């Protein structure tokens, strides 16, 4: 719910993120359909050239079950990954809003 979505391609996330009530930092984590356990963070942002865009970051899987976007910090779950980037952008194009 809210932020986690299963069976949402890149283009479906973009359409969702780019909708009216969303702002910069509006995001969603989506799970791959042809590949379970492969996640993607999608964030709505601004490009000086294109305007409102949606940026996609691959969530890497740790062998022990946790995840991470950047090698500098890893998490045990997606909730922790989200809570982190909502309180600091830490490399992300923007801090997520939620």
């Amino acid at each position: 719910g809210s932020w986690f979505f299963k069976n949402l391609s890149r283009k479906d996330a973009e359409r969702q993120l780019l909708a009216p009530g969303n702002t910069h930092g509006s995001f969603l984590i989506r799970e791959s359909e042809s590949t379970a356990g492969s996640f993607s963070l999608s964030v709505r942002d601004f490009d000086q050239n294109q305007g409102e865009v949606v940026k996609h970051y691959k969530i890497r899987n740790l062998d022990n079950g946790g995840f991470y976007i950047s090698p500098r910090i890893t998490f045990p779950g997606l909730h922790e990954l989200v809570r982190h980037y909502t309180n600091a952008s830490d490399g992300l194009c923007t801090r997520l809003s939620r």
Partner: peptide, 6 residues
């Protein structure tokens, strides 16, 4: 495709 992060 995917955004890289340092």
């Amino acid at each position: 495709q995917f955004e890289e992060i340092p």
